[PDB]
Amino acid sequence: MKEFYLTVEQIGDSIFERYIDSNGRERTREVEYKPSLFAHCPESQATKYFDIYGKPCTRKLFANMRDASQWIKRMEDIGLEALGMDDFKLAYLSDTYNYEIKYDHTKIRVANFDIEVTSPDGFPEPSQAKHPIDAITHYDSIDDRFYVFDLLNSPYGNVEEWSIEIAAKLQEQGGDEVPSEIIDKIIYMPFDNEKELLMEYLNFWQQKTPVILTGWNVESFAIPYVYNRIKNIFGESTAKRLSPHRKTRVKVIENMYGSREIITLFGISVLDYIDLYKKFSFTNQPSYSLDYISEFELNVGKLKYDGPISKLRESNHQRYISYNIIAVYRVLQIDAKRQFINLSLDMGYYAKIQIQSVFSPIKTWDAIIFNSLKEQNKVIPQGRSHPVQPYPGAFVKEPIPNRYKYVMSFDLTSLYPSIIRQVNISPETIAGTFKVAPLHDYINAVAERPSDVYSCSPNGMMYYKDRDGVVPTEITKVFNQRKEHKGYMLAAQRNGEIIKEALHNPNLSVDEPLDVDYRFDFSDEIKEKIKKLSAKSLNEMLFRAQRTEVAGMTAQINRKLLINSLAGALGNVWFRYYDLRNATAITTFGQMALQWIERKVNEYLNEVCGTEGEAFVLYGDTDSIYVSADKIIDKVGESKFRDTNHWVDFLDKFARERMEPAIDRGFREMCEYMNNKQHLMFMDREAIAGPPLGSKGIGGFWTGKKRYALNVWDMEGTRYAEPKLKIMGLETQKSSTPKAVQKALKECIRRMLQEGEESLQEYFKEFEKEFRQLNYISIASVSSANNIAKYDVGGFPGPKCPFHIRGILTYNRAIKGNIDAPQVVEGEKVYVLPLREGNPFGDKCIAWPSGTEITDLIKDDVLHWMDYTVLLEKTFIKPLEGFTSAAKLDYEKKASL
DNA sequence: CGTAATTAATTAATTG
DNA sequence: AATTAATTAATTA
Numbered sequence A: 001m002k003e004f005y006l007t008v009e010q011i012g013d014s015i016f017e018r019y020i021d022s023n024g025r026e027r028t029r030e031v032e033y034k035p036s037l038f039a040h041c042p043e044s045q046a047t048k049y050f051d052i053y054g055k056p057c058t059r060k061l062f063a064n065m066r067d068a069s070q071w072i073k074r075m076e077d078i079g080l081e082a083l084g085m086d087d088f089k090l091a092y093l094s095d096t097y098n099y100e101i102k103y104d105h106t107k108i109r110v111a112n113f114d115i116e117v118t119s120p121d122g123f124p125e126p127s128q129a130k131h132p133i134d135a136i137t138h139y140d141s142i143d144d145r146f147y148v149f150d151l152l153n154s155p156y157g158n159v160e161e162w163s164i165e166i167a168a169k170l171q172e173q174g175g176d177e178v179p180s181e182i183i184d185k186i187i188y189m190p191f192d193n194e195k196e197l198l199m200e201y202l203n204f205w206q207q208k209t210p211v212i213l214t215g216w217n218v219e220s221f222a223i224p225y226v227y228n229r230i231k232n233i234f235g236e237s238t239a240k241r242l243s244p245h246r247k248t249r250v251k252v253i254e255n256m257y258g259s260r261e262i263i264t265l266f267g268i269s270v271l272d273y274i275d276l277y278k279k280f281s282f283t284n285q286p287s288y289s290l291d292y293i294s295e296f297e298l299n300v301g302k303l304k305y306d307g308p309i310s311k312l313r314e315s316n317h318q319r320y321i322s323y324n325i326i327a328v329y330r331v332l333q334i335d336a337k338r339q340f341i342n343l344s345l346d347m348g349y350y351a352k353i354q355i356q357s358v359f360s361p362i363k364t365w366d367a368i369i370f371n372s373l374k375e376q377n378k379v380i381p382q383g384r385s386h387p388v389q390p391y392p393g394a395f396v397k398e399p400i401p402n403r404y405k406y407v408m409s410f411d412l413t414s415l416y417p418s419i420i421r422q423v424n425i426s427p428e429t430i431a432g433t434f435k436v437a438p439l440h441d442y443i444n445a446v447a448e449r450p451s452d453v454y455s456c457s458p459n460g461m462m463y464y465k466d467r468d469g470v471v472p473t474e475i476t477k478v479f480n481q482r483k484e485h486k487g488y489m490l491a492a493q494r495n496g497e498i499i500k501e502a503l504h505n506p507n508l509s510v511d512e513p514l515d516v517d518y519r520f521d522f523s524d525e526i527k528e529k530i531k532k533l534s535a536k537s538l539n540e541m542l543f544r545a546q547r548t549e550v551a552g553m554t555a556q557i558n559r560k561l562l563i564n565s566l567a568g569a570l571g572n573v574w575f576r577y578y579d580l581r582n583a584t585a586i587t588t589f590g591q592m593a594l595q596w597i598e599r600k601v602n603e604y605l606n607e608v609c610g611t612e613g614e615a616f617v618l619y620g621d622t623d624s625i626y627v628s629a630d631k632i633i634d635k636v637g638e639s640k641f642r643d644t645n646h647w648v649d650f651l652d653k654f655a656r657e658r659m660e661p662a663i664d665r666g667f668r669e670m671c672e673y674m675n676n677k678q679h680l681m682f683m684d685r686e687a688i689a690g691p692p693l694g695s696k697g698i699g700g701f702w703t704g705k706k707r708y709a710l711n712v713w714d715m716e717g718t719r720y721a722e723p724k725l726k727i728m729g730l731e732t733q734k735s736s737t738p739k740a741v742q743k744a745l746k747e748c749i750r751r752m753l754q755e756g757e758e759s760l761q762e763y764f765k766e767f768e769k770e771f772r773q774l775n776y777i778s779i780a781s782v783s784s785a786n787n788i789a790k791y792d793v794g795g796f797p798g799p800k801c802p803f804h805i806r807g808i809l810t811y812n813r814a815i816k817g818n819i820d821a822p823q824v825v826e827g828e829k830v831y832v833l834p835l836r837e838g839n840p841f842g843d844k845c846i847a848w849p850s851g852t853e854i855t856d857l858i859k860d861d862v863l864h865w866m867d868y869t870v871l872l873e874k875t876f877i878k879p880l881e882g883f884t885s886a887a888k889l890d891y892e893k894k895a896s897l
Numbered sequence B: 001c002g003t004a005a006t007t008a009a010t011t012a013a014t015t016g
Numbered sequence C: 001a002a003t004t005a006a007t008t009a010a011t012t013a
């Protein structure tokens, strides 16, 4: 096997690299790297180096890395360009690994942990860390073992050792229910006093120093606390042992009075899972407590205990230690399903960057292009300073707010990455400019042809057609990877619906789940055996098919997110290849591509229907159009269709056979008209929406831009077993909206599109009657807590203070005195509830941290004054009024006249 | 230190 | 109430 690195850092003029050799063992080294930088030189001088624009460069090899740093400083005030990779560690990895890396994750020591700290004077701040650490659970990837460290004696209580026998027992039995699969993998370690626990953990840390370190909030709590408590006990230099190189940095955050810090251990790539999640999950959550996320991702129970958390050890020490392990493990379950760690490594290595650098797409693309160019002996241009500027983006069409019965959408395959490829947009493929006609003259094909030599964009930019640019070439590779993983995801999706269609009639047999590969569609062979399967074996097959989908999803969505970020990065000033001329060239083309095809599709469906100038494209957004199919089903008659599925198959066949060839005819012409490099505007059909055949439902509606819902039967190949709702932008998809309300409105949309006006009315009074009996947390609103510092004038709402902050400033006065109350963290998310006028809180609403039940001392007083009539009108009624008024419907039958 | 476009619910102020 | 403008938080792409 080939060699690969694990972690890379720079300390002085020396690079510290932990790696895996050709045999497959862990080795650490220290190299006096000699970095080379570049500068422009005389025309007539034979050398093998050129900058990206083609101009020659002379190589300056430096004796050490300070000499290379010094050199750039001098080059600046003198006024010359210092070309080459100035982030030197990357230039080390590009040399020491001149090939495409193939890592073996089993060799990479991934470790994730969590600690527990008992604090009876408030929330234990990691910066002070004046309280004892009374637990640590620390998993290892190569050991496959849970290393539990239990403190039995502390000046906050002395507790009997943790029973592994009780731990295994079920919750309902009196136990803690630690999943039996890991129970044999726990290696329990209790301790006499605090100091001797920490000493052992460090030896273990040395013997088994992590390469990837993770967990839940480990960066903002665990690591900060571990380091700081050791600083208070063993010293700073003994705490510096957490880095396998001894070097560590401390970053302190603001903050008027409150001090929070983030520690940087050199030689360990830290990826905090909470970060990973927000970045790669594509879910905006109400709460980011480990409990809530596990509930959401794994449908597992919630960690139930009595008393505040600061007193849990005292009473239920058994559950305290047990729950600690579960936490450490729950993350591992989230990753087995989500596979973000795998993604971090897939990306990190392909880019040749520190693994924690995957959070930065600019740092990612800078390494990808540098390595792309270096093999061609080209030299990267120096990073410049730019003023921040707004620039035009995507075109969004204004729809007529209305119901729409039959709808087919048509979407562009990875649009912005495609335009880069079609036009050949790169920093070095720029030719010049041209006279820009109104965008509309290009949309209507009436303006003069921009170029007969160059590839052009309606933002007035010409690009070379001869040899490929470095960006289009680099984005293609990653787009191809993205694609492969999507074709997987889509199968596991299609195969999910084959299991669900068959689950209609499950057999009362005793059979077992077939061993099949879910990334590829079931053959009409395996399909037939599924139709004979037990309900037991069908549901287990469905799980497997869905987990495959998730895993596939993660791969394809974040590879997408990555390449889209490159397009966006051209608009961020810190990106080495920042160029508004290029970013606008993309977006502007996008605007033309959509509005051009809006014309073309309308022009076709008039020529097919023999009609003259009627509208069919009703709404468009960035890269997709929505086509009304009313006239199509009208022309063949509603009477003629056997079942709902029959007209779906008919529109399916129509869109693929009659439309797409005219759509691809239209995009080929636009290519000619723009004299582009390559035609890459592929628009296939996406969703097929409509009511159930012979039902009262309305199909779909629009309430305006970026807000609508659809009854979708087919979603780009996946024929759904049960009709599925596509809701975009409505309060059902907004995290701020209460869970009970999200659920309720979704049933309203469901009945609107599927069952008719009459159905809506019946359910509306069904809900209004159940509302006042529902749990507060479910019916409470959510919002982020930004700028709470500003609107606070020593308590009480300031000038123009937002509704939620107003609510928080209520909380602070209520918990004035109570230490056993959770503090509202700036940036964190909170629940918001409106009180009635005349309450012990002296305000119109209150707010408290998300996830957590509101502290005992005020909880009673909140429910004692909650304004349900307002909460219902605000969250539920007003948005539904929005839906029905834009759909020509009534939710509550008129009591008047 | 990836992006823009767009919404709805706020509030402070003015509708003689 | 009902307009507008200004601000915040959240979407869709």
Ligand SMILES: Nc1ccn([C@H]2C[C@H](O)[C@@H](COP(=O)(O)OP(=O)(O)OP(=O)(O)O)O2)c(=O)n1
Residues within 6 Å of the ligand: A411, A412, A413, A414, A415, A416, A417, A560, A564, A565, A567, A568, A622, A623, B003, C013
């Ligand atoms: N976070 C995002 C997502 C969207 N867009 C741009 C890039 C896309 O090209 C275009 C359309 O986005 P889509 O949601 O339709 O995703 P793609 O077209 O990129 O991929 P797919 O082929 O799956 O539709 O909008 C963007 O700039 N940044």
Ligand SMILES: [Ca+2]
Residues within 6 Å of the ligand: A115, A116, A324, A327
């Ligand atoms: Ca905990």
Ligand SMILES: [Ca+2]
Residues within 6 Å of the ligand: A411, A412, A413, A414, A415, A623
């Ligand atoms: Ca798309």
Ligand SMILES: [Ca+2]
Residues within 6 Å of the ligand: A411, A412, A413, A414, A686, A716
């Ligand atoms: Ca698509």
Ligand SMILES: [Ca+2]
Residues within 6 Å of the ligand: A502, A505, A506, A507, A530, A531, A532, A533
């Ligand atoms: Ca069956």
Ligand SMILES: [Ca+2]
Residues within 6 Å of the ligand: A411, A412, A623, A624
């Ligand atoms: Ca789309």
